[PDB]
Amino acid sequence: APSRNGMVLKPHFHKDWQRRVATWFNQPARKIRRRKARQAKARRIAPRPASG
Amino acid sequence: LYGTWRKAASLKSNYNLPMHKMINTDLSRILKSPEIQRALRAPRKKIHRRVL
Amino acid sequence: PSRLRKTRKLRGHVSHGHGRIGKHRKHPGGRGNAGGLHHHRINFDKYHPGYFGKVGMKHYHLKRNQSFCPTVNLDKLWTLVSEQTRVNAAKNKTGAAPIIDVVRSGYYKVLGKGKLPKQPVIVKAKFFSRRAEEKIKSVGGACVLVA
Amino acid sequence: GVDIRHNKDRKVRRKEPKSQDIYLRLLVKLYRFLARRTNSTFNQVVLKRLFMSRTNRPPLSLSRMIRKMKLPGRENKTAVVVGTITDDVRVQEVPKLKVCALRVTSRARSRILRAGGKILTFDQLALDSPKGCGTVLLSGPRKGREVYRHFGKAPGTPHSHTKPYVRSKGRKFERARGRRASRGYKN
Amino acid sequence: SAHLQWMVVRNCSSFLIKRNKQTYSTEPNNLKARNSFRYNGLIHRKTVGVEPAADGKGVVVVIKRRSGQRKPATSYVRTTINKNARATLSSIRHMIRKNKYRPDLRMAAIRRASAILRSQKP
Amino acid sequence: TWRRWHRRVNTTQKRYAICSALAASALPALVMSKGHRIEEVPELPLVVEDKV
Amino acid sequence: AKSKNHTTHNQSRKWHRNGIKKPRSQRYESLKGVDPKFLRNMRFAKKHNKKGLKKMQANNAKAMSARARKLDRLAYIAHPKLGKRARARIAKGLRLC
RNA sequence: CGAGUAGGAGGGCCGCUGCGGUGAGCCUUGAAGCCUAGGGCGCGGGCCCGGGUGGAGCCGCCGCAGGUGCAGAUCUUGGUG
RNA sequence: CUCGCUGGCGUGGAGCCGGGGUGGAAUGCGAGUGCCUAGUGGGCCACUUUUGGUAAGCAGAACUGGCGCUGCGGGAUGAAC
RNA sequence: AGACUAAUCGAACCAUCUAGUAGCUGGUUCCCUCCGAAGUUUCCCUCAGGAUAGCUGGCGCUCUCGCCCACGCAGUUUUAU
RNA sequence: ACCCGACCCGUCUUGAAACACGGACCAAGGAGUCUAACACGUGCGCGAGUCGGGGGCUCGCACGAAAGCCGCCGUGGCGCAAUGAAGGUGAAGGCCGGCGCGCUCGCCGGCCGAGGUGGGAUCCCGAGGCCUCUCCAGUCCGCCGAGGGGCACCACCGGCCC
RNA sequence: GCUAAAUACCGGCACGAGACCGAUAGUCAACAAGUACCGUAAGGGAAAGUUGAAAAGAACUUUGAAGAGAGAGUUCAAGAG
Ligand SMILES: [Mg+2]
Ligand SMILES: [Mg+2]
Ligand SMILES: [Mg+2]
Ligand SMILES: [Mg+2]
Ligand SMILES: [Mg+2]
Ligand SMILES: [Mg+2]
Ligand SMILES: [Mg+2]
Ligand SMILES: [Mg+2]
Ligand SMILES: [Mg+2]
Ligand SMILES: [Mg+2]
Ligand SMILES: [Mg+2]
Ligand SMILES: [Mg+2]
Ligand SMILES: [Mg+2]
Ligand SMILES: [Mg+2]
Ligand SMILES: [Mg+2]
Ligand SMILES: [Mg+2]
Ligand SMILES: [Mg+2]
Ligand SMILES: [Mg+2]
Ligand SMILES: [Mg+2]
Ligand SMILES: [Mg+2]
Ligand SMILES: [Mg+2]
Ligand SMILES: [Mg+2]
Ligand SMILES: [Mg+2]
Ligand SMILES: [Mg+2]
Ligand SMILES: [Mg+2]
Ligand SMILES: [Mg+2]
Ligand SMILES: [Mg+2]
Ligand SMILES: [Mg+2]
Ligand SMILES: [Mg+2]
Ligand SMILES: [Mg+2]
Ligand SMILES: [Mg+2]
Ligand SMILES: [Mg+2]
Ligand SMILES: [Mg+2]
Ligand SMILES: [Mg+2]
Ligand SMILES: [Mg+2]
Ligand SMILES: [Mg+2]
Ligand SMILES: [Mg+2]
Ligand SMILES: [Mg+2]
Ligand SMILES: [Mg+2]
Ligand SMILES: [Mg+2]
Ligand SMILES: [Mg+2]
Ligand SMILES: [Mg+2]
Ligand SMILES: [Mg+2]
Ligand SMILES: [Mg+2]
Ligand SMILES: [Mg+2]
Ligand SMILES: [Mg+2]
Ligand SMILES: [Mg+2]
Ligand SMILES: [Mg+2]
Based on DSSP, count helices (H) and strands (E) in chain B, helices before strands: 2, 0
For CA atoms C130, C136, C142, C144, the dihedral sign is: negative
Give residues whose Cβ lies within 5 Å of ion ligand 17. Answer: C 17
Amino acid at E102: R
Q: How far apart are CA E48 and CA F30, in angstroms?
A: 18
Q: Largest alpha-carbon pair distance within chain C?
A: 85
Rounded Cα distance between D119 and D116, Å, is 10
CA-to-CA distance for G89 and C44, rounded, in angstroms? 90
Distance CA D60, CA D80 (A): 11
Residues 6+ apart with CB under 8 A from D71: none
Cβ within 8 Å of residue A45, ≥6 positions away = A52
CA triplet D95, D96, D102: central angle to 5 degrees? 105
Are the beta carbons of C100 and C120 closer than 8 angstroms? no
Spatial separation of the C-alpha atoms in residues E52 and E116, rounded to whole Å? 7
DSSP of D107-160, one letter per residue? HHHHHHHHTT--EE-HHHHHHH-TT-TTEEEE---GGGSSGGGS-SS-SSSS-T
* Of E76, E79, E3, the residue nearest E43 (C-alpha): E3
Listed resolution, Å: 3.9
Which amino acid type is present at position F14?
A: K
Cβ C18 to strand I below 7 Å = yes
Candidates D42, D35, D114, D127; CA nearest to D82 is D42
- The answer to whether chain G touches chain A by having 3 or more C-beta pairs less than 8 angstroms apart is no
* Mutation for testing the D interface, residue in B36, B37, B44 having most D CBs under 10 Å: B36
CA D61 from chain centre, in angstroms, equals: 10
- Chosen for mutation from B24, B25, B29 (greatest number of chain E CBs closer than 10 Å) is B25
D43 φψ region: left (φ > 0), alpha (ψ -120 to 50), beta (else): alpha
Question: Buried b vs exposed e over A14-36: b needs ≥16 C-beta within 10 Å?
Answer: eeeeeeeeeeeeeeeeeeeeeee
Which of helix, strand or coil describes residue B34?
helix
The DSSP-derived string for chain E is: -HHHHHHHHTSS-SS-EESSSSEE---SS-SS----STT-TTT-SS-EEEEE-TTSSSEEEEEE-SSSTT-TTTTEEEEEE---SSHHHHHHHHHHHTSSS-STTHHHHHHHHHHHHHHH--
CA D90 to C1' K88, in angstroms, rounded, equals: 29
Task: Find how far residue C138's CA is from the centre of its chain.
Answer: 29
End-to-end CA distance of chain E: 44
Chains C and D touch (3+ CB pairs under 8 A): yes
DSSP structure string for A1-48: ---SS------S-SS-GGGS---GGGHHHHHHHHHHHHHHHHTTS-SS
Query: What was the elucidation method?
Result: cryo-EM
d(C-alpha A43, C-alpha G59), whole Å: 95
Give helix D22-36 / helix E2-9 axis angle, nearest 10°.
Answer: 110
**Rounded Cα–Cα distance for residues B51 and B48 (Å):** 8
User: CA-CA distance, E61 to E96, in Å (whole number)?
Assistant: 11
Say whether C36 sits in a helix, a strand or coil: coil
Is the C-beta of residue C95 closer than 7 Å to nucleic acid chain K?
no
Question: Which secondary structure element, helix H or strand E, spans residue C122, and what is its range?
Answer: strand C122-125
Residues D137, D78: Cα–Cα separation, whole Å? 9
Pairing of strands E17-18, E76-81: unpaired
Please state, in angstroms and as integers, the Cα–Cα distance from residue C124 to each residue in C68, C106, D4, following that order: 17, 12, 76
- Antiparallel, parallel or unpaired: β E59-64 and E48-52: antiparallel
**DSSP designation for C12:** T
First-to-last C-alpha distance (Å) of chain F: 46
Task: Compute the radius of gyration of chain B from its Cα atoms.
Answer: 23
| Whole-number Å distance between alpha carbons of D49 and D81 | 10
Which residues, listed in sequence order, are joined to residue E79 by a DSSP beta bridge? Answer: E61
Q: Determine the Cα–Cα distance for residues C29 and C49; give it in Å rounded to an integer.
A: 21
User: DSSP readout, chain D?
Assistant: ---SS----S-----S-S---HHHHHHHHHHHHHHHSS--SHHHHHHHHHHS-SSSSPPBPHHHHHHTTSSTT-TTSEEEESS-B---SS--------EEESS--HHHHHHHHHTT--EE-HHHHHHH-TT-TTEEEE---GGGSSGGGS-SS-SSSS-TT-----SS-STTSS-SBTTBSSSS---
CB proximity list for D139: less than 8 A, separation 6 or greater:
D49, D57, D58, D60, D81, D82, D83
Comparing CA positions, the residue from C43, C52, C42 lying closest to residue D179 is: C52
State the sign of the Cα–Cα–Cα–Cα dihedral E1, E4, E10, E16: negative
C111 closest CA partner among C99, C95, C123, C121 = C123
**Residue C22 C-alpha to ligand 4 middle, in angstroms?**
6
Strand, helix or coil at C97?
A: coil
Distances (CA, A) of D113 to A45, C51, D80, D98, E4: 57, 54, 17, 10, 29
Q: What does the alpha-carbon distance between residue A7 and residue C31 come to, in Å, rounded to a whole number?
A: 16
| Beta-bridge mates of residue E77 | E63
Whether the CB of F2 is below 8 Å from some CB of chain A: the reply is: yes
Question: Is residue C125 a contact partner of residue C108, using CB atoms and an 8 Å limit?
Answer: yes
Alpha-carbon distances, residue E111 vs A15, D151, E56, E57, E78 (angstroms): 78, 65, 20, 17, 19
DSSP C125: E
Residue C74 neighbours by CB distance under 10 Å: 22
Cross-chain Cβ contact F12/B17 below 8 Å: no
CA-based nearest residue to C115, from C77, C145, C80? C77
Residues preceding gaps in chain B (C to N > 2.5 Å): none
Residues making up chain G, counted from first to last: 97
Cβ of residue G4 lies below 7 Å from strand K:
no
User: Alpha-carbon distance E119 to E113, whole Å?
Assistant: 10
Could you tell me how far CA D14 lies from the centroid of its own chain?
Answer: 16
In angstroms, the CA B30 to CA E3 distance is 12
Q: Which amino acid is at D163?
A: K
Q: How many CB atoms lie within 10 A of CB C128?
A: 17
Phi and psi at C97, nearest 5°, equal: -145, 145
Give the number of beta-carbon pairs within 8 Å between B and E. 9
Q: Which of D79, D77, D59 shows the shortest CA–CA distance to D120?
A: D79
Q: Are D46 and D137 in contact (CB under 8 A)?
A: yes
Going along G7-97, which residue ranges are E strands? none
What's the one-letter identity of residue D75?
Answer: E
